[PDB]
Structure formats: structure tokens, C-alpha cells
Amino acid sequence: VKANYIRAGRLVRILRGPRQNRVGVIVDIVDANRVLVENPCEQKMWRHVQNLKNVEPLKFCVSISRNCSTKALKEALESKKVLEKYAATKVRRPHRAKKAFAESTDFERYQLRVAKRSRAYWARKIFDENDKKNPVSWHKVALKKLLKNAKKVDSTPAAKKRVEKARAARKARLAAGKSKTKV
Amino acid sequence: KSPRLYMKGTLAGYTRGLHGQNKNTALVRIENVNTTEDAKWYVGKRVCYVYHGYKIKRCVRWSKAPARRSNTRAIWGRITRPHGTSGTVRVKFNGSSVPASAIGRRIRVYLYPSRI
Amino acid sequence: MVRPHLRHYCVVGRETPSEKNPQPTVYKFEVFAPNFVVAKSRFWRMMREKNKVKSTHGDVLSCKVVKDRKLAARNYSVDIAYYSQRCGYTHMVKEFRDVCKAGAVSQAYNDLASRHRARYHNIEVLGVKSIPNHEVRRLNVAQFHPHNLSFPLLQRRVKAPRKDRVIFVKKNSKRAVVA
Amino acid sequence: MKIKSHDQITFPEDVTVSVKDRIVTVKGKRGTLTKDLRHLQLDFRVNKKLRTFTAVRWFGNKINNSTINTALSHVRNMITGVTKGFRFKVRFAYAHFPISVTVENQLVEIRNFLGEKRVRRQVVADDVKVYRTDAALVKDELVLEGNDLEQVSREAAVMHQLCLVKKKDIRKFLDGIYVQTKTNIEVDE
Amino acid sequence: PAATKKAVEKKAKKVSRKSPEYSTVRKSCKPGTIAIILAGRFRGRRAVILKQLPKNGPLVISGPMKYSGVPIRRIDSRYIIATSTRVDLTGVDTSAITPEIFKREKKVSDERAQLQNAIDTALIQAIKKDPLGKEMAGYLHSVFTIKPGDAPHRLKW
Amino acid sequence: PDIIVIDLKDHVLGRAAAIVAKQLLLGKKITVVRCEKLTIAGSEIRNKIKYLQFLRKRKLSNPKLGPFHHRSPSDVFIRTVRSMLPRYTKRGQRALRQLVAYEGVPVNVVRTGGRVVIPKAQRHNCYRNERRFTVLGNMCKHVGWKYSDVVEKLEAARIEKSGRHHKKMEKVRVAWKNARKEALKKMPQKNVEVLKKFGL
RNA sequence: AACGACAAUGGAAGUACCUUCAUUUCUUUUUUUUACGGCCAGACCCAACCUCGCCGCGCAAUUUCGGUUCAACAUCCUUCA
RNA sequence: CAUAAGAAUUGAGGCACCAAGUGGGCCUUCUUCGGUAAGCGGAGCAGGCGAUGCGGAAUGAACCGCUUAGGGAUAUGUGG
RNA sequence: CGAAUCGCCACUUCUCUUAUCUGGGUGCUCUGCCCGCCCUUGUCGGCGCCCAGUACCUUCAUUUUCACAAGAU
């Protein structure tokens, strides 16, 4: 499954040159590892020639003549709207975001983090089904343990007399509870 | 929750070519850096190696809440210039070496006295 | 290409100041030399041999850098003379299509170095020319001449450790080759 | 580095093939026969989903180009076994000394050589099947057959090597049990 | 910084002479910033710079306290990283601060008690005059200081 | 970083060594597993000759004291690392004293993390993805190396439980997926929340 | 309360321990660390070192056959020329 | 002392008194003799070593770099 | 007081003088098995499918989310 074929009029990603991540399209392949590339971006990418090591094809392949003009290019590739289509590609997120991340500030950050915190304790565990599902070890276990504590309660250790004593004990906790807070 | 605002780094070595090493100048590679320009920022800054003293318990002095005490002792020095793309930095002390085996040991890189 | 390695200068020179040559008669090359210091050396040198004339007697008027057409590939033919192998001048004809003649000279020289083992002095690159027909000779240039030439390609690099993030400590996540 | 590239597979018709991984899984009349190939991956591109598969390369090196063929052919032959199978005929051949071979089935027993010396035995590996056949003037004859020539063959070649002799001249040596027809089980579709 | 310049020049000089009887400031700051105190007594904590005391020396900082836990304080710039956040302290007075107050031989004091409070107030409206020094995100509230990794010279903001 | 454990499945031997060498040097107890999938170049023949020749030497009087050949896949590597380390350094030794490697993989310990491999040490990444190569176990088999069979067994087990675990996670992780959603775009707006473009 | 992969004592270096010397000392005195004209160096940020001249570009033009298509034609131009 | 046309230098020159220590060398670019040869012998030139260390050549009298007050700070050398 | 191992983590914290752990498998041939497909069926181009990747957990209960007491001694 080897497949994003270079095909003149393919949209390639600038991967580590300074000129990384501008965009442009194949206007030639100058052979082995080099390209001739072009864009409408006013300042980078002009017509550049760039190393193939450095590029990633973006799976927008258009038709256009191999070896070609800006002017033709500018418009058909504008017409192709693939920039936009590429723009919508997900890959894109973090890195356009990266540039952003550099330049945030704290508060923003805190929120940003906080977003997940908000969710965290609040929408998975929380509740009641999936925490009746895995659940969390304590839940899972408390439930399971509860079957193994059908064992006391229900069953073959425990709880027909001694839990009555537990009832005595339970109050006993409260007898001390009451007492202890009363000093 | 805490301080923790210096980067652990490790004091790597003295400067060197072959017969001719520089005990006077030591190298730290500062965690997450290895990025010399970036390191350029770090320059001068005073680094600390805190050790615990093992031996005889000193803290002659009181400072600290006062009667400072410890047997943990700690060394400061300052960085001189980075090198290597991988951010070696060279570091100097106002004194001379940071023990004599504190090399290889992990060390702390403060971010100030501040230049912001 | 264009790692623009090598430079191109045109030298224009003249024979004798002496009225013993009243009226010297003038020489041109555009020559690929990496600097003019050389360039003029070379210029002179064929003059010292081919033309037998010592530099120290005669006079270069000019040595001036010479620029390629434009932005795109033209098909170059290259013609070569190399002297080595302790067996002197020998010729070769080779073929490059690119946007720069310079890159071609350049590329030859490595190519010879790698490829015939050679060393630079020992070559005199005769000529580079844009080839007009659909030929363009050589199989490799012809190979990639195709209208609708296009490709698949895979399995290599990007620097794995690094200062642009990040040495030994990697990977935070999981592996394959990646593409 | 100079582009060969790597990839997968060529095709014919009535037999299914893997098309995926290093491994071709060929399925037809006689079952399914499958092989896993090492570095043998090479410019595939499917031309029909069911109907056309090729792998006939773009660029690369000299050495590369050979392989491409060698690869098809062998898998083609994967198809062959799966379709028309393999049938090897061998005949024991001897003049001064009579020579006898039977087939245990699970194994092949070889007697007599030169009065017999050791008993040559070959366990019948899978799907090389062995018949001593004799009526129809079937004659000092073993028949190895099954749907993997390479195996049917390997076992076979092995046999020719099982009937080796040394010391005291090939100019008087001949006798042994030799390959007499390496074929398909039949013509088949 | 910033734009077009040789600035603030006036058709007579490159050239010489610094601060006579006005403080020189930290060669990068402007008051009313949010600072994060780097070391000593309150390392990692979010406070606000008011001003640097009379002489060349030290910013008065306050969070105000309830946001942060900030006691107001003399600090050096070269012990803070200075946010991009800034407010006017126009209503804040900060007029009386004199360092004798800050001598611990002169530090709880009623003076302290009043002055911080006064101050705090002043900050507070200003802060309220532009939200989220407190609100949420603080700014000032946080807990978390520096995660292992992406150190300040990489922290552009 | 603490308590480190690296996974040597398909890692270029020398490079990995070296790399680690610096690591150890810079000081840290690190651990290798999938050691059997550490790799050696090209051919077993080639790998043998080298080992054989290595094995072959003696300390003639007392051959028992020249080099010993713990033929574990681990032991090979590590020793290499010693080689790439300066042994006789008293420091390196202590360094050595830090260092940990187990052949294979003693299990319980990989389960919320352990995703860890090391840069250049990725053998395909290092090796031309079309050059021939040979695998460590294969070598150690070639020189015998006892546990291989066993190791296999052990491996299969390891995978299973890991799978078991894995399925279990698989279940939760959907719940975990299910993590909100809901009210979560009511992230702010004043002083520029784009948490929507940021992490959301 | 000194230590030991194993040369041995050795340099150099610093720490530890030290039995250690000598010196100086704070409610207006010392001490480590900040900080500071003009200085007194080193590094960042933008400007420009000009210029005759091609180069080209454009146009047309010839030669000049290539990508589209299943191929030919369109599309004598993909373009090199 | 111009040309109208063709030095540079010149951290002095002049000049001298008188006594030592040395006379086995060895190494090298270059030239070259003897002999097959020889890390051999045997000369010619320059340079070394010797009689110096430092820095380089995993190892080296003579190879590379470079010579040295004592330091300090910086940058290079050969070499990486 | 205007830095100063600082007071934490921690003789029950230790592979180490200061993020938990985000966990299992595999190939280059896949950014989700991804997938599937279609299509002048090619180098493909197009379309589709799915949730799955879209590495990745940082602990008040928050801090989706108001908010609040308390440093300075």
C-alpha cells in the first residue's frame, strides 16, 4: 500500500527547510531528490527548488502541465481549492497550533488544561454505566467484592449474627463518633 | 508541590582535545535543551550542585531559620558559552571544581539571576 | 539541483603589453571555477601552454561572473577531458538535464570523483550545452524525460535524535517506519 | 540510492493469489499454495482487482531487474501446482545389477544397488506422493507427484542425489535412479 | 523597539550621560506587570509589580494576597519573569513606600496591615477593570510551576 | 528520567550500543528487552566468523582468563556496550554497576507506560530498507545459546497476558473515549480561548 | 573513626576529613552575594558596497516532437531547442 | 642623486681582546655513488635530531603542528 | 529585610537531592484494520466506508464552570 505517487501538480509539504510548511506544488521534479515548486504566496513560496527529502506530498494531485507557469498555476490551483482541502486536513492541527502554543500565556494555558480536567472526573467515570462497566478498580472491585461480600452479607462468611454485632459496631463507631466530637 | 524550577542537567566533562583537557572548564548538557542557540540564553547562569555531605557534619555557621544545619552542601558556578548543536555548555566556577567526582552527576540549572 | 557549488566566471584577456605585439588579439571563456583566483589561473594556464604564454608577461582585462538563463531545466550535454591514471588525457561524454550548467559541472566533478575515481585538476571539463531535441541522449535523462513522468518512492530518514527535538529519549509513542 | 521500489505482483486468471504481504497465497483447483518472500518485494500495482496484476518495475539497479521475473515465474508456478499439479516420473536404471524400489507410501524404499549396499529410504514429504507403477509397461518406475513442483522436484533431485556412486570410474558408472519426466500431473484447467 | 528609529534623539547628539536623580529602570520593564517570582521566599508565585522603590533597586510586588497568597515585597527584576500582562496602577498610590518599611527590623506591623490593604484595593479595581487576574485562570491563582522540559527560552508567550 | 527500560526489537546493534554508551555515561539505569531482536548485519556466516574467531582465542596458559562468552543475546550487547564504554574506568565501572539489561523480558512492569525505544537505534531506520540483515537470536542460536527455545515459550505467554490486559483496556478506553464531549466549548472567550483550536 | 580491581608510591585538580595556621569581626565595623559613571570590551536589530553589462522577458518566428487518450487528434509546443 | 622611467631592508655599524667547550654522530625532503638487496653501505645540497619540550599522527628521537618566562582571558595550529 | 541547597518530595518515597506512569502485538504497505470501492482501472484518479489515531494520564471535587482565605514577622 504504497501510494501517494508524485504526480506533477502534487501538493508537497515543506518538511524541514526554513521554508517548511509553506506550500507549493510540483512544477518540475528536478530529478532524484529535487523539485521545482511554485505557489501564490506572496512571500514564500515563490518558485522554489526544493529537496525531496524535505518534502511530503499531500495527496492533493491536480492536473496541470509538467513544467509550468505561475500564472496558469496560480489560477488553476486556486481553482483547485486544494489548499483549503489540505487546510481541512487534520494532520494540520497541532502544528499550526504549535506556532500558536509558543505564543500563548498562562491563563490560556491553564484553561486549556482545565478543559480536560473538567472532563476528566466528569464524563467517563462519571457515570453510571461505564463505572458499572470496567469499572474503576475500586468500583469494579466494590461491585465484585460485593459479590464476594455477598459473602458476608449474603453468605458464607459472616453477617447473620456478627453483622448484627456489626450493627452494634456501627453504632459503636457512631457511639465513639458522637462521643469523640463531643470530647 | 514545590520549587522544581531548574533543569536537571548533568555535568559531563572538562574541555578537551587529546593531551590537554581543561579541568578549569567543565561541560553540562542541560536536559531538554541540546540546542545551542537556545543554550545561548542560559549563558552565565549560575548552576548548582547540591550534594549531601556524607561526612562530618559541618555547617559551621547558622543562617537558616537560623542554625541552618545540614550536612548537605551545595556548589554554585556560572556557564560560559554553549557549543555543539546538541547544546554542550561550558561552565566555570568562581572557585575551582565542584568536587572531584561530581562529574557525571546530575546538576541543576537555574534560569536566573533573571534577564527578562 | 542548486547547491550552487562551483562559480562561473567569464574571463576576457589579452597578450602582450609590448608593442612587439602592437595590438593583441583577445581571448574569452566562460569557465567554471570556484573563484576568480582560480579562474584567472586557469585562463592563463592554457595560455601558458596551449598558447605558450606566461601570465606574468601578459594581461587579463577582465574576469566577470556569468549567469544562467532562468528558472527551469534545459538539457545539458557534457564533454570531458581527464588526464589522470598516469595516462593522461582521456575524453568522455556525459549527459545532464537541469536548470544550471554550474550544477552540472559540479556534479560531474563529484561524479568523476566517485565514479571514475578522479581528481579535479586533472579534468578539464570541455563543455556543457542545452540539448534541444526530444533527445537529449543518455538513458537516465531520457528515463526521466517522460511527459507524465511521475513516481512512487519510499523508505528513509529525517534526523532521529536532534536539537530541533530531540536526542536519545525517543520514542514517546510507538514504531513502524512512518509514511 | 536509485529507485527500484517495493511492492508486489503479476497475474493471469483463474486462480486466486494473495496480492498481500511478502506472501502470495495462491488458490485454485488443486487447492491453495502460498509463499512468503523475503526482500522480494518490488513495484506492484494492480491493474484489475481481479483481473490484472503486474509488477514490472520503474527504475532501480541492475541486480534488481532480474528478480522481478524470477519472482513472477515462481508464483506462476505456485499457480501451476494449484492448477495442474506436478508429476514426476523416475525410472531405476541398471544393467549389471538389477535394482528395486518400492514405496511404503509414507516413505520410499530403495533396494538393490550393486547388489545393494545400504537401503536408500526417503520419507515421503508432504505432497510429493510416490507411486511405483508397473503395468502399462510402467517400468522400474517411480512416480512422484503432487502440487508443488519444487517440492516434488526437490525430493526428486534429492533422489538423483540419493543414487550417487563413487570410486572406480564414471566411464563404467551409470546405473542409478534417474529422472525420467518432470511434468504436471496433467493438463488440467 | 519599536519601528523606525535612532530613537528618542534630538538633532544634537548620539552620545552620553544617563540617570541623574531619577531612577534608572530594569532595562526591559514597565510597571503594572504580572510577575512570577522566581526564587527565595515566594518562588513560583503570581504577583503584580507596582513600582521600583525610590532608588535603583526593587519592585514592589503584590498579588493581592487572596489571589495568590502574595505578600507584597521588594524584589529584583532579575528574580522575576515579567508577564506580557499589564495594568495601570494609576489609582494605586504606592506613594509612601520606602524601604525602611521593608527592613525586617521594620516589618505584624500595623503599617503593613494598612498599607498592603490599601494597595491591594487599588490593584483590585484595576484588576477588575480588566478581568482574569482573577476570575478563573487566575491569572494569579495557579498551582503548577514548571513542568519538566520546554524551558523559558523556549517559552515565547 | 528514572528506572529506565528500552525495547530492543529491531535495533541497530552498534548504534544502539553507542547510544546507550553515552547514556550510561551521562549516568542512568536503563534496561533492555527484545534483545533477541537486536540485530546483526547481513549473514549468519559473517556473524559467526566473527564470533567464532572471538570465541576461538585463548589466554594460552590459562585460557580461562581472556574473554568469556555468556552467550546470551543480552550479554553480547551489553558487553559491547562495555566495549564502547571505557572499562577500566573506575567511573565507567560504577557506571556499569548502574546499568541493567535482562535478556527477554520479566513482565509485570509494562502496563501504563513502557513505549520506549531510542532514536537512531531503529534498525530499519538505520539500515537500508533493502539491504540484507541477520537477527541476534539467530546468532546466539548459532553459537547455541541455551534458552532460545524457552524464551520463545516465555514470549508467547507474555504476549498473551499482555493481550488480556490489552482487551481489558480496550474496553475501558472506550469509556475513556467517552470522556466529555458535552459542556466543553464553554471554555471561555475573553483574553482569547481557542481551546477549540488548541486541544479540543 | 584513615583506606583498598590490583602496580606501587606519582602530577594535577577538587572535595571530604583534619590534628591544622594565621587573619579579621557587625546594636554606625566584617562576609557572601546584587548593584554601579564614565568606563573600560566582547554579541543582537534593522540600512547599504556603487555599477556598465547581460540575463531575461515579452512577442513573434523557424526548426523542434512530447504530457493528455485505450492511442490518434485537439493540445506545431510538454519543452527542451 | 627624479624618471620622464625600475628595490626592499637596514631594532646599529665599524672594529677587537681573549679564553672554552667540542673533533664517534645520528635522522630527513632533495641529488647521488656501491651492491640484488638491505631499517645496508657510501657521498652532495638543505633541514633536523642530537642538545625541547608543548600540540597533533591509538604507538613512535628526527613524521604533522608548533617551540617554550609565569599566569590569566580569548582565538586559532595540526588534528578532530 | 531585595539572591543565598530551605525547609518539599522524602530512616514506610527511592535506582537514586523533586510529573503520574498515557502501557500489550505488527509491517513499511497505509494518518483509524483503516477499510472498502469505484473509476480510460493507473504510476492512478475519484468516491465511498468506519470510529479508530486525532501518540499521549499532570490528581479540589477544581481549574466545562463562578470563585475564595491566607502569607509579608
PDB file of C-alpha atoms (C1' of nucleotides) in Angstrom, chain I:
ATOM      1  C1'   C I   1      14.944  42.901  55.141  1.00  0.00           C
ATOM      2  C1'   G I   2      15.974  42.705  47.742  1.00  0.00           C
ATOM      3  C1'   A I   3      19.632  36.202  45.812  1.00  0.00           C
ATOM      4  C1'   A I   4      21.846  32.735  49.022  1.00  0.00           C
ATOM      5  C1'   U I   5      20.862  23.692  48.661  1.00  0.00           C
ATOM      6  C1'   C I   6      15.228  25.651  52.691  1.00  0.00           C
ATOM      7  C1'   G I   7      12.566  23.971  54.629  1.00  0.00           C
ATOM      8  C1'   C I   8       9.342  19.917  49.796  1.00  0.00           C
ATOM      9  C1'   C I   9       9.488  15.163  47.669  1.00  0.00           C
ATOM     10  C1'   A I  10      11.089  12.442  51.097  1.00  0.00           C
ATOM     11  C1'   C I  11      15.142   6.177  58.096  1.00  0.00           C
ATOM     12  C1'   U I  12       7.245   3.132  55.477  1.00  0.00           C
ATOM     13  C1'   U I  13       9.301   7.822  48.896  1.00  0.00           C
ATOM     14  C1'   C I  14      13.803   5.611  46.017  1.00  0.00           C
ATOM     15  C1'   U I  15      17.978   3.214  41.217  1.00  0.00           C
ATOM     16  C1'   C I  16      18.871   7.441  43.239  1.00  0.00           C
ATOM     17  C1'   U I  17      18.892  15.785  46.163  1.00  0.00           C
ATOM     18  C1'   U I  18      11.726  16.922  43.184  1.00  0.00           C
ATOM     19  C1'   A I  19       5.367  14.554  36.685  1.00  0.00           C
ATOM     20  C1'   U I  20       1.961  10.420  37.258  1.00  0.00           C
ATOM     21  C1'   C I  21       3.175   6.109  34.911  1.00  0.00           C
ATOM     22  C1'   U I  22      -0.892   7.793  28.579  1.00  0.00           C
ATOM     23  C1'   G I  23       1.025   0.702  28.835  1.00  0.00           C
ATOM     24  C1'   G I  24       0.262  -5.222  25.293  1.00  0.00           C
ATOM     25  C1'   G I  25       1.368  -7.175  19.018  1.00  0.00           C
ATOM     26  C1'   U I  26       2.938  -5.754  13.536  1.00  0.00           C
ATOM     27  C1'   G I  27       4.708  -4.366   8.666  1.00  0.00           C
ATOM     28  C1'   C I  28       6.754  -0.028   5.587  1.00  0.00           C
ATOM     29  C1'   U I  29       2.432  -1.486   2.875  1.00  0.00           C
ATOM     30  C1'   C I  30      -1.397   2.606   4.571  1.00  0.00           C
ATOM     31  C1'   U I  31      -2.505   9.435   9.226  1.00  0.00           C
ATOM     32  C1'   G I  32      -8.113   4.785  12.228  1.00  0.00           C
ATOM     33  C1'   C I  33      -7.936  -2.924  10.061  1.00  0.00           C
ATOM     34  C1'   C I  34      -8.333   1.787   8.438  1.00  0.00           C
ATOM     35  C1'   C I  35     -11.099  -0.416   5.479  1.00  0.00           C
ATOM     36  C1'   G I  36     -13.810  -0.565   1.129  1.00  0.00           C
ATOM     37  C1'   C I  37     -14.617   0.761  -3.582  1.00  0.00           C
ATOM     38  C1'   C I  38     -15.316   2.679  -7.870  1.00  0.00           C
ATOM     39  C1'   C I  39     -13.442   4.714 -11.752  1.00  0.00           C
ATOM     40  C1'   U I  40      -9.946   5.012 -19.645  1.00  0.00           C
ATOM     41  C1'   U I  41      -8.729   0.612 -13.793  1.00  0.00           C
ATOM     42  C1'   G I  42      -3.013   3.696 -13.496  1.00  0.00           C
ATOM     43  C1'   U I  43       2.020   5.437 -11.788  1.00  0.00           C
ATOM     44  C1'   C I  44      -3.766   6.021 -10.831  1.00  0.00           C
ATOM     45  C1'   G I  45      -7.726   9.439 -10.440  1.00  0.00           C
ATOM     46  C1'   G I  46     -12.162   9.683  -7.836  1.00  0.00           C
ATOM     47  C1'   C I  47     -15.722   8.209  -4.465  1.00  0.00           C
ATOM     48  C1'   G I  48     -17.151   5.706  -0.523  1.00  0.00           C
ATOM     49  C1'   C I  49     -16.985   3.049   4.329  1.00  0.00           C
ATOM     50  C1'   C I  50     -15.818   3.416   9.925  1.00  0.00           C
ATOM     51  C1'   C I  51     -14.500   5.488  14.653  1.00  0.00           C
ATOM     52  C1'   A I  52     -10.295   4.381  15.374  1.00  0.00           C
ATOM     53  C1'   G I  53      -5.200   7.757  15.923  1.00  0.00           C
ATOM     54  C1'   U I  54      -6.657  12.554  16.068  1.00  0.00           C
ATOM     55  C1'   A I  55       0.544   9.132  20.380  1.00  0.00           C
ATOM     56  C1'   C I  56      -0.293  10.930  24.824  1.00  0.00           C
ATOM     57  C1'   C I  57      -2.736  10.499  32.040  1.00  0.00           C
ATOM     58  C1'   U I  58      -0.323  16.018  35.141  1.00  0.00           C
ATOM     59  C1'   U I  59      -4.781  14.370  40.596  1.00  0.00           C
ATOM     60  C1'   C I  60     -10.013  20.394  44.927  1.00  0.00           C
ATOM     61  C1'   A I  61     -14.172  17.733  43.907  1.00  0.00           C
ATOM     62  C1'   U I  62     -11.046  22.368  40.508  1.00  0.00           C
ATOM     63  C1'   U I  63      -9.180  24.871  37.458  1.00  0.00           C
ATOM     64  C1'   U I  64     -16.577  22.978  31.275  1.00  0.00           C
ATOM     65  C1'   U I  65     -17.635  26.298  35.379  1.00  0.00           C
ATOM     66  C1'   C I  66     -18.101  31.316  39.388  1.00  0.00           C
ATOM     67  C1'   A I  67     -14.577  31.728  42.864  1.00  0.00           C
ATOM     68  C1'   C I  68     -12.296  32.478  47.892  1.00  0.00           C
ATOM     69  C1'   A I  69      -8.888  32.725  52.863  1.00  0.00           C
ATOM     70  C1'   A I  70      -4.107  33.134  53.908  1.00  0.00           C
ATOM     71  C1'   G I  71       1.410  34.789  53.979  1.00  0.00           C
ATOM     72  C1'   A I  72       4.803  39.502  54.416  1.00  0.00           C
ATOM     73  C1'   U I  73       7.360  38.792  61.158  1.00  0.00           C
TER      74        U I  73
END
